[PDB]
């Protein structure tokens, strides 16, 4: 499950199709993306 | 007419001191150009064990991704080398670790906020705040469970604070140690400070005795110059505590007195440990390197 | 059957054919064993020049140039101190372990 | 940020020392000279890594967008 | 290379007369016996070894004929033809040292069939190279042997007539 993050409350809050794209709760608009589980890699240098 | 039966007939070997992290040792009569290369072994050629490879699943902490996989490779591991092997470079990486040459550690931590009474420390009012390197869980992976049970791998200074979190936050790696020369990268020189100095020499010319002595004695450390009277005037107890500071030679009634020079086949090595190994050790380790350098060179053919 | 033959080239552009004034180059050495060796190449009563040059800091090379005065080449002279500096590396890690076991 | 794990000039491991110094001047009431001593700095290359550090991730720690306030 | 087609020509080919085998041998030592006095001291003014590619070459050639075909050049007393076993006496001990820079595998096999015809007794100065030891372009026209064994599967039937193995 795909989720976003609000803001300005910062309740965790996925999104689908036909939705205006708001915070639920709040009614904010500026709705930044959570990161998610998966594999990224490095040298340790 | 050198010879190297001459070379061990004069060659002595002083320990000062030897303690589990740090040794001071010095050697007597060998030239510079020999003692410079074990000061250059131990800091570069000697391997030792680091984190190389870092597989973030998530972080979400503040740090950086590539700057937290930074600091877990200057993080020194207690793995004793002569455990594992090399890894190869031109084999791909399905094949390229395995339960012989890789260590895997890993490290998963969620902050999360605690009822606490009450501005208030960090570490009262967040459950897992600060990440410290002792979370490095070891995974024994393969065949390293029978023969890493007496010697889990633990860092060298477990204190060494990684990271720091705060509630939601969380991160979860897993990083691979292989085995490397400092050379390459720093963060695999098993020594902290491999270094040696010279012994200083005082070579005191006229008789300096009296009052002067007294001042004589201020111009170098307490345990350099010791006074009894005009007779035993002022003779050098240990030229080796002297640090050359030249104090001495910025008074004038000192300046023709007394000269400042080395004894130049005289080291003064000083060598700490990064945790991994003995200090003592980490010699023997940079002498039977540099004798290794030279029996490959030796056994070895010339084409055109 | 397997040797390693970049370790080491002898520069035939530079040697001469009476053998006794060559120019080698090792790969991957720098003033490490190149310091050492001459050092204890200049000992050898029939050597008349050694000098170690690395030619550039970026590629990890190592040029020693040994002349003889005679009846000794200088890949006879190379690996005479090729054994006195295994020799005298021997010396150090047998006076080196008797003082830890004086401690 | 966060202090750094070794010393840069010389390579001693520092990272460790950053919480405890901050009780040598608190708890102890020491000055910064023997809060340095006390613990094992005793180069001036690495003496200069735990005193001068900024500790900057507290200021930044502050803004987080994953929790409520 | 032609030269290096010479000798695996010749001992490479079954249906051949044997009075072919010998005026290619006969006119090869010929070349080194008119090699014999316009160019045997240049050896010790200031030049190199590589001044004398060509000949060692040829004598390399020579000496690839030998360790296939030596039987016909037994005759019928058993003796050799045209002083074969008084030509590489002389060859192996010149100011050349043609057993050195030649090719390794075709001298050591003609050290051994010199031993098992009595014709030379060169391996003490294959011996003699202890101490003793551009060039890479003419290291490999040594090793390219041209009629080496077919790997085609289909062909080689029509060609055992022609091509002869190895014993």
Not at chain 2, 58 to 73: C, K, W, Y
Not at chain 4, 26 to 55: F, P
Not at chain 5, 12 to 41: D, G, M, P
Not at chain 5, 62 to 67: A, E, G, N, P, V
Request: glycine share 4%; charged share 30%.
């Amino acid at each position: 499950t795909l989720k976003y993050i609000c803001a300005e409350c910062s309740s965790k809050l996925s999104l689908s199709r036909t939705d205006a794209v708001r915070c639920k709760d709040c009614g904010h608009r500026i709705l930044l993306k959570a990161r998610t589980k998966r594999l990224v890699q490095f040298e340790a240098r | 007419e050198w010879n190297v039966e001459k070379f061990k007939k004069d060659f002595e070997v002083n320990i000062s001191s030897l303690d589990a992290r740090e040794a001071n040792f010095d050697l007597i009569n060998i030239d510079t150009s020999i003692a410079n290369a074990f000061r250059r072994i131990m800091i570069s050629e000697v391997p030792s064990v680091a984190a190389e490879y870092v597989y973030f699943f998530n972080n979400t902490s503040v740090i950086q991704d590539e700057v937290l996989a930074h600091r877990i490779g200057l993080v020194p591991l207690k793995v004793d080398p002569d455990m594992l092997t090399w890894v190869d470079s031109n084999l791909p990486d399905d094949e390229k670790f395995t339960d012989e040459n890789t260590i895997v550690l890993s490290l998963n931590v969620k902050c999360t906020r605690n009822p606490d009474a009450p501005s208030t420390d960090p570490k009262e009012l967040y459950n897992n705040a600060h990440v410290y390197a002792r979370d490095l869980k070891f995974e024994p992976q393969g065949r390293q469970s029978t023969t890493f049970a007496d010697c889990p791998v633990v860092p060298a200074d477990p204190d060494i604070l990684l990271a720091k979190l705060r509630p939601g936050q969380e991160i979860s790696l897993k990083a691979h140690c292989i085995l490397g020369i400092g050379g390459d990268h720093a963060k695999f020189s098993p020594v902290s400070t491999a270094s040696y100095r010279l012994l200083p020499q005082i070579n005191i010319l006229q008789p300096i005795k009296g009052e002067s002595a007294r001042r004589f004695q201020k111009c170098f450390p307490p345990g350099v110059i010791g006074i009894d009277e005009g007779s035993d005037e002022a003779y050098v107890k240990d030229a080796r505590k002297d640090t050359v500071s030249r104090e001495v030679l910025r008074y004038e009634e000192f300046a023709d007195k007394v000269k400042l020079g080395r004894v130049r086949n005289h080291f003064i090595f000083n060598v700490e440990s990064a945790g991994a190994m003995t200090p003592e050790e980490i010699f023997f380790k940079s002498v039977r390197i540099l004798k290794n350098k030279a029996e490959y060179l030796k056994n070895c053919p010339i084409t055109q | 059957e397997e040797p390693d033959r970049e370790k080491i080239k002898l520069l035939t552009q530079a040697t001469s054919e009476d053998g006794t004034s060559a120019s080698f180059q090792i790969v991957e050495e720098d003033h490490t064993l190149g310091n050492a060796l001459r050092y204890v190449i200049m000992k050898n009563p029939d050597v008349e020049f050694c000098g170690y040059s690395i030619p550039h800091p970026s590629e990890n090379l190592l040029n020693i140039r040994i002349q003889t005065y005679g009846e000794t080449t200088a890949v006879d002279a190379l690996q005479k101190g090729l054994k006195d500096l295994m020799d005298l590396c021997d010396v150090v890690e047998s006076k080196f372990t008797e003082k830890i076991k004086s401690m | 940020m966060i202090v750094p794990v070794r010393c840069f000039s010389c390579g001693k491991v520092v990272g460790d020392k950053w919480e405890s110094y901050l009780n040598l001047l608190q708890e102890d009431e020491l000055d910064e000279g023997t809060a340095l001593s006390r613990l094992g700095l005793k180069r001036y290359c690495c003496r200069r890594m735990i005193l001068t550090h900024v500790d900057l991730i507290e200021k930044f720690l502050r803004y987080n967008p994953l929790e409520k306030r | 290379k032609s030269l290096q087609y010479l000798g695996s020509y010749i001992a490479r080919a079954k249906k051949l007369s044997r009075t072919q085998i010998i005026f290619v041998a006969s006119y090869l030592t010929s070349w080194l016996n008119r090699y014999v006095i316009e160019r045997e001291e240049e050896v010790d003014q200031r030049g190199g070894m590589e001044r004398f590619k060509h000949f060692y070459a040829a004598f390399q050639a020579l000496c690839y004929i030998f360790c296939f075909r030596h039987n016909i050049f037994r005759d019928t007393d058993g003796n050799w033809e045209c002083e074969l076993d008084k030509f590489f006496q002389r060859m192996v001990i010149s100011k050349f040292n043609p057993l050195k820079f030649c090719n390794e595998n075709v001298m050591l096999m003609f050290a051994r069939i010199a031993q098992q015809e009595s014709v030379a007794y060169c391996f003490s100065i294959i011996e003699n190279n202890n101490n003793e030891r551009t060039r890479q372009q003419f290291i490999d026209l040594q090793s390219y042997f041209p009629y080496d064994p077919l790997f085609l599967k289909n062909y080689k039937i029509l060609m055992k007539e022609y091509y002869i193995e190895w014993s």
